[PDB]
Amino acid sequence: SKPFTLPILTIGELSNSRFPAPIDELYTSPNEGLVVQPQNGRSTLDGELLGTTQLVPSNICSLRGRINAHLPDNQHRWNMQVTNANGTPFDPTEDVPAPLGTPDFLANIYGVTSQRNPDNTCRAHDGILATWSPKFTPKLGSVVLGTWEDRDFDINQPTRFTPVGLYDTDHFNQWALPNYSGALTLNMNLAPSVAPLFPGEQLLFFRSHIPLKGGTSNGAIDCLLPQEWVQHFYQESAPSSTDVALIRYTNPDTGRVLFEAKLHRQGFITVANSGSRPIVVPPNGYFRFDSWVNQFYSLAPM
Amino acid sequence: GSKPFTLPILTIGELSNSRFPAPIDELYTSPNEGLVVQPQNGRSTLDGELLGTTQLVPSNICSLRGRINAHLPDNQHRWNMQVTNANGTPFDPTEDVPAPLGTPDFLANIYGVTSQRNPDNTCRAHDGILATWSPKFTPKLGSVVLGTWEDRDFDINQPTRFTPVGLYDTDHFNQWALPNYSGALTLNMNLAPSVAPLFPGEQLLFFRSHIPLKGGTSNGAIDCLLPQEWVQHFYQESAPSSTDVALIRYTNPDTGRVLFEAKLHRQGFITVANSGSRPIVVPPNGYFRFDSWVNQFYSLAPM
């Protein structure tokens, strides 16, 4: 078989796969009572992308298309038809939950909506992508973008939303999926929920504290795999010999090993740990693949 | 045996700009008559030695982070920021880089958002400008100025980050003009070298993005020598280069149909046999594949 590998990347060299941001720390938590089912940053270990996951980092939580209308309310809102990169409208019959890169959490996402016309005249206005809105219907090919009172966009010109962070904390829940087709509809083609199946284990996350325009929050976005691991597995396509890869967080200069973890075939990590805490790792260290083990493998407790 | 050199399996719609956070929109070639082409982001040798200000994390391209340390005494709503490493230690100007890694490598009014989060999780963010042409843009000395608008304030000595979005306007915009990383009347140091064709009848080939512009008229073109994914691939692979020039061919893997060929130079840039300034259209499913080690005297099939 083509041997399985992880990329040689320290924590300061990793990116979040659910929001455009550097990884700030590793984190573990029980997430009691919640369903953990992110749709970005989802890949099998042998490189099959899942959910809404795609490879281009600047397309994470970005959508593009053409603005088609200014809405007749007092909220300064603009409807956008979502397109592919070639300008063709999104096809709702594609077996994805939503256009690739669509945000996978409820929030008021602060960002900038920009346009460039064929004659190279441009405009951009900061504002909000409300992923909880009844008119957030990206699987139907349309979303609404907000800005402020005095701002206009051009109808039917190429349009892009660049995400920046959270506008505020209203509606923010990183583990609540949007209704990709709007109210009273079921999401489809989802990457499965993930949970520890072995006793004494918790998920391990790659955490970013993303920007927040106003309010009080740690802004935590937890991904199952950093974007670089998604990219690596996609390129490598190494066969998964068992359901679980044993990985160890290692300092390459001294060989000192900090802890060990289970990297599951479906693309997430578990550790033997209790409670919600940040993990501190050596700045020069990174996970190394050790061996393929079985699901009942007992990890050394952190 | 030596590890074979390879390019990643990535179509043009799967590539990223290495000089600005943006997808690649097209390939582009140009003689760039009379200009010195010397970008500092998106620079790597084929064997994976990063050069200039190049670093691996895509969301850190044209970002700076640190701690705001002063509100400046004019009507311009400008804030001085001490640049830091991720752990909060100040940037060390004696590091043999031109500037902190990921620092912008072109003159512009860059539109973005400056955000803060205090230890007690209280936050604030305000849009505004990073003016890389300003006398106060001195990232190699560990400080830059950030603008916002009236009656917007930041906390002194709290963690701060600038997220770039695009161009604020076109004033001072020149993608091939390097900043003065240490300010007025200083020389830039530790630069990745300028690049140009070495063989007659060739031009550079660029991976081009049209980045956002807040107001004005411009195609917003940012041309990189290597997409960010190729920088990332070479860094991981570290395959030794057998000669100074790799012959690469833009190929559709479904049919084997080859569109054109190019030279991928050891120092990390591409040339093609072409004349004139024009975008290039490629098959959506195609990508460059490494064909063979040639050398600089290899005569390319004309595009």
Numbering used by the authors:
A (entry chain A): 224 to 525
B (entry chain B): 223 to 525
Q: Which passages does the manuscript contain on this structure?
A:
The norovirus genome contains three open reading frames (ORF1 to 3), where ORF1 encodes the nonstructural proteins, ORF2 encodes the capsid protein (VP1), and ORF3 encodes a minor structural protein (VP2). The S domain forms a scaffold surrounding the viral RNA, whereas the P domain contains the determinants of strain diversity and recognition of attachment factors. There is considerable antigenic drift among human noroviruses, and new genetic variants evolve every other year, which can result in new epidemics worldwide. It is well known that human noroviruses bind with various specificities to histo-blood group antigens (HBGAs), which are present in saliva, on the surface of epithelial cells, and in mucosal secretions. To elucidate the constraints on non-HBGA binders from a structural perspective, we determined the X-ray crystal structures of the capsid-protruding domains (P domains) of two GII.1 (HV and noro485) nonbinders and one GII.2 (SMV) HBGA nonbinder.
HV was the first GII.1 virus detected in 1977 (15), noro485 (GII.1) was discovered in ~2005 (16), and SMV (GII.2) was identified in 1982 (17). HV, noro485, and SMV P domains diffracted to 1.86, 1.50, and 1.60 Å resolutions, respectively. The equivalent residues in the HV P domain were Cys345, Arg346, Asp375, and Gly438; in noro485, they were Cys345, Arg346, Asp375, and Gly438; and in SMV, they were Asn352, Arg353, Asp382, and Gly445. In the noro485 and SMV structures, Asp375 and Asp382, respectively, were pointing ~180° away from the fucose, whereas in the HV structure, Asp375 was missing because of the lack of electron density. Additionally, in the noro485 P domain structure, the polypeptide backbone of the loop hosting Asp375 (termed loop A) superimposed poorly onto the corresponding GII. Moreover, a neighboring loop (termed loop B) may have influenced the orientation and stability of loop A. For example, in noro485, loop B was oriented differently from that of GII. However, our new data indicate that Asp375 in HV, Asp375 in noro485, and Asp382 in SMV are unable to participate in the stabilization of the fucose moiety of HBGAs because of their flexibility or suboptimal orientation.
